[PDB]
Amino acid sequence: IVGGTASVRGEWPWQVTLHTTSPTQRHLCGGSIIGNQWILTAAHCFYGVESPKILRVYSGILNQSEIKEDTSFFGVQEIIIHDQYKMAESGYDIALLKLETTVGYGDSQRPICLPSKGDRNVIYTDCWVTGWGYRKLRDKIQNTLQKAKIPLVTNEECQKRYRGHKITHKMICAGYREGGKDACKGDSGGPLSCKHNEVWHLVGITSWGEGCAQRERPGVYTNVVEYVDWILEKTQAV
Ligand SMILES: COC(=O)Nc1ccc2c(c1)NC(=O)[C@H](C)CCC[C@H](NC(=O)c1cnn(-c3cccc(Cl)c3F)c1N)c1cc-2ccn1
């Protein structure tokens, strides 16, 4: 996150850090708890990941330094990638992680509500992007979870900013015309959480952008409302 501030412990209790174990353990992407065995994240995070066996999900983390060999995590039973996904820039950048064990909900780890079909018409004015990613284009994974409030942008305005790309309605963009506050490397897969009627909703998944926090380069997010039926299809299978 560029131009953000340190989060307070328990501020984004749905935020998880997804680690890979191969070849050595490191943070890979962000993700969000959406169900007691479900993490919603970005499909591009699993490029080259040949097995769910190398993955570890950590919930209830403020600082990456809380993670040691003795830190408890959730194993991944299954990686579910949208079958239309080709690349982040073309969309369908959505994946579900089925956890091997159930998340026990509490003040440190709990789910974020998915948007409602009726919330397709609502205007969100209090949206935040979070993560342990870079503060600048060439940087390193941050110890403390950062947050940055970002304004949503119309599809029309976002399409003007990305000549040569096709910004679909299954994408949602957010950013300041002057840049300065944005997601950056290592934040991808994480949430764009928007508060509405005192309830937080998972509006987007950090997907792609041209560099980080550049002027007239909104961040492009998977528009979660357009995948609610897909999420229920995969999480509520009979
Ligand atoms: C000690 O541990 C580490 O050092 N771990 C570590 C370090 C760096 C990275 C990483 C893990 N993860 C990966 O390599 C994964 C396989 C994911 C690959 C794509 C990912 N892209 C992005 O994060 C990415 C691309 N565009 N945007 C973006 C920019 C503005 C607004 C919006 Cl809305 C945007 F989404 C991103 N946040 C990315 C992540 C890293 C490097 C390069 N790219």
Side-chain angles (χ1 to χ4, degrees), residues 1-68 70-116 118-120 122-137 139-177 179-238:
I1 304 287
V2 183
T5 56
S7 292
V8 173
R9 197 180 288 278
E11 228 189 318
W12 316 99
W14 47 92
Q15 175 86 59
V16 305
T17 173
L18 172 63
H19 283 219
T20 183
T21 248
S22 176
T24 66
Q25 197 180 322
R26 65 178 202 144
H27 163 88
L28 197 71
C29 279
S32 307
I33 300 157
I34 60 153
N36 63 22
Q37 68 186 343
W38 299 105
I39 304 298
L40 193 67
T41 183
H44 73 254
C45 292
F46 310 100
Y47 176 80
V49 168
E50 26 47 75
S51 173
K53 293 184 174 190
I54 61 162
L55 297 183
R56 284 177 176 198
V57 171
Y58 294 93
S59 53
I61 302 290
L62 172 62
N63 296 301
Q64 286 290 334
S65 55
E66 293 179 45
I67 306 170
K68 284 177 71 179
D70 65 1
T71 310
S72 68
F73 59 92
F74 296 94
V76 178
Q77 205 184 98
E78 205 190 347
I79 298 158
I80 307 178
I81 283 159
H82 197 292
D83 64 37
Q84 282 178 276
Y85 170 77
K86 170 70 209 174
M87 56 201 293
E89 287 161 284
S90 292
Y92 307 98
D93 195 13
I94 191 170
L96 279 155
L97 298 178
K98 195 183 188 185
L99 304 182
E100 278 169 344
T101 50
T102 271
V103 171
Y105 297 165
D107 295 301
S108 84
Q109 52 196 39
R110 57 199 189 60
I112 183 168
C113 289
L114 291 176
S116 309
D119 289 350
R120 213 191 233 86
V122 314
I123 304 145
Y124 299 96
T125 57
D126 188 18
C127 296
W128 296 76
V129 60
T130 54
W132 291 266
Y134 291 13
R135 288 156 307 173
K136 54 184 235 287
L137 205 57
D139 201 25
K140 57 170 104 75
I141 293 310
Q142 297 306 291
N143 187 45
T144 313
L145 185 64
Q146 308 281 126
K147 55 174 179 185
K149 180 169 180 165
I150 311 287
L152 291 187
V153 150
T154 64
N155 221 249
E156 180 175 52
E157 171 89 347
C158 188
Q159 179 64 89
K160 295 189 202 303
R161 306 296 170 235
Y162 285 104
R163 221 213 153 192
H165 280 97
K166 180 54 190 182
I167 309 301
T168 71
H169 275 91
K170 286 184 167 47
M171 299 178 177
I172 194 160
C173 315
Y176 298 88
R177 197 187 193 273
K181 288 179 168 206
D182 210 354
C184 201
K185 319 292 181 175
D187 292 316
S188 76
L192 169 65
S193 316
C194 305
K195 192 183 205 172
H196 179 247
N197 292 350
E198 295 306 295
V199 179
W200 287 98
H201 293 93
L202 184 57
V203 167
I205 301 159
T206 303
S207 184
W208 62 275
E210 183 58 56
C212 307
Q214 304 204 90
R215 164 190 188 157
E216 288 160 63
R217 291 297 196 169
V220 186
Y221 297 85
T222 304
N223 188 14
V224 173
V225 74
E226 299 303 321
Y227 296 91
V228 169
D229 289 344
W230 178 84
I231 290 158
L232 298 177
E233 175 200 346
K234 304 296 178 168
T235 72
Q236 321 274 276
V238 298

